[PDB]
Design a protein around this ligand. Sequence first.
Ligand SMILES: [Zn+2]
Ligand SMILES: [Zn+2]
Lengths: 382, 377
Amino acid sequence: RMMKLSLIKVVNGCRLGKIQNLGKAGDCTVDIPGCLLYTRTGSAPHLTHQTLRNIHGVPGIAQLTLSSLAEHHEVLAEYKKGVGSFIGMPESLFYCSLHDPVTPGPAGYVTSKSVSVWGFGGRVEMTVSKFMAIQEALQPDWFQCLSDGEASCAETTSIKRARKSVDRSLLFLDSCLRLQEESEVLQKSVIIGVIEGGDVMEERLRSARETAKRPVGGFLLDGFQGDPAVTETRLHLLSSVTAELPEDKPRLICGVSRPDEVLECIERGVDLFESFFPYQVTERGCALTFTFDEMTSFEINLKEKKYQEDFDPLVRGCSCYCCKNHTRAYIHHLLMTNELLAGVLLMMHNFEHYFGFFCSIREALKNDTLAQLKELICRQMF
Amino acid sequence: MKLSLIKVVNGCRLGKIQNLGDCTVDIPGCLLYTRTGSAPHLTHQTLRNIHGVPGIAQLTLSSLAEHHEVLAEYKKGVGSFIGMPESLFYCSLHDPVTPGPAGYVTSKSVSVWGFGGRVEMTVSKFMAIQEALQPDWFQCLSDGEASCAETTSIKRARKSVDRSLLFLDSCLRLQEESEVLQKSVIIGVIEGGDVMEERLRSARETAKRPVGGFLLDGFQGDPAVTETRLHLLSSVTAELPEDKPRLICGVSRPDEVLECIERGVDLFESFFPYQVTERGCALTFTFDEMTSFEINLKEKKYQEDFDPLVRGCSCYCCKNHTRAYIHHLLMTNELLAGVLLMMHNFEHYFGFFCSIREALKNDTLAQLKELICRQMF
Ligand SMILES: [Zn+2]
Ligand SMILES: [Zn+2]
């Protein structure tokens, strides 16, 4: 409950559908497969709430991260009306992840009693009760449960480390559920259970099976993120895990946002992705250009002099604010003259492009043409 | 262009500049501060959501001269280049916030400094750049560095006057031969430094040329225009014709602005609210490095302050957000803070000029001046 996931069809393991009645007011509808708006603190990077509304296709749910907010627990707790109200958008929908995928901290601070996050001012150690107190201050519609995602950070794959991540995460889960039952302000918030177990198949499946026994609203597939992309072994692990999860609850994944990875994960039953990739592209002065009808092959770098006299838009036929009004040469000029407006403009285009890519995925699932889209993406990446 | 004065109260000129031929600029007033043609932090859509935005924007050779070749290849002018082809632009020589070092003026060339370094401009290089930019108004190449010398000397002041008249007559000649600069207006620059006689000679000689207006150069002060230079300023403006606008550069703080309006100056740069924004501050002074007119949102005392920046402000930030929110944006290292502060600081500064003009209409400027200076201490 607390949301209604309906599937239109499942083509080659890809789940095409929508999640209805979600959020604290139970009135938002999200399409799947889909992404969440990437933010750190609840406000989109570079973008006023009004400017964000000038981007086409903005997702119905925004991500914010405990990493960046945990230091401000005292202010938000005294304020008590929640993050949405704090930023001047009470009607917004928020999923609160534990970590910022763009800037994760060092490994090795997880114990059976606490998990640490790193914000702008440094490290914050969270017991279960400290973590739930923060959630009571933030009041997100969805929140990732406190979890141990560091089994794969060990030098080798060991049963003991994988087993511990499963058991720690279930202990955290049952404790947070208990504290949520006793909380006036978290009654309409939904906890997301976290699948752990590292690279050990049996512990992965046990984590999936045990987590699904709890009344979580959905599941976060944790620990599959790859450099540069999810490895083939972890894709196999992924579809084994999703096969054990109930079909009527959404599957989220963290740390997976690049278009080729996204498609591999959709094929293996993942529904919802973080959109930090276009933010990373913006931060290095780049624009996403890949067609869907370190810097990657999906993008151009507007700092390069070859764009100083390129009076074409970032993407021809793009209708974002930047491509409606500006050229490559202009954006290059803004970067050269060190005008921060460049970051605003790139963020608008990169979000709009990335969200359009997800719209295109869903159309491909409808038309049963996903395999051609996938080859199109991977031809641009090589 | 046609300047018409509604009234002149106590030396203050209230009026409007028309035929700019569908745009109007109110005087006394400011120009929108930009470096490259785009308002700092603000998309053109966001800028149009600010009340009271001036009819003409300033841009500077400091940031543009280095990209002459791009703009010449583009051909359609800077307003078209930045996506605002219908907008009005005044091109000044230097960026008032970051003009770069002094000591690079000769009788043959003047230098500006941008992100990529020094750009040295002879008269013909300067006019070629203006042909690429195609601004509606432009400051003539000029020697504004007489007062930068270690002392006041007749010889240095005389050179600033004579160099500037020679640049002026050469630029006028080149403009007459320029099809694309035919609809552009040249602004003559009064120089002469701190020597009364050379200031007056610069004023009288510059007014003999058919310039569209005058730029009062070399009066800028730290923290504000000195009393000696205010005396010098009013001696100069007394020599200028009344029916042409007077601009001043490097003078933007509200107390300085009011002193210069009293002495017949019409148009000011609006870099002050940009400076306020860049140090994480908000203007709060009433008009019904950090100065007394402002609050500093990085300070912890605002972390739980759930009032707007300014009660009753109509800007996007004060209509929707709290001080505590802005403080949090700064603390969590979000450039969105700068966008919102710039929106408010421009809106507040533009409201201040609206209030100046209202005070001239009602003959109550002296009360506004005292209200401002009381908050400056
Ligand atoms: Zn675009
Ligand atoms: Zn305001």
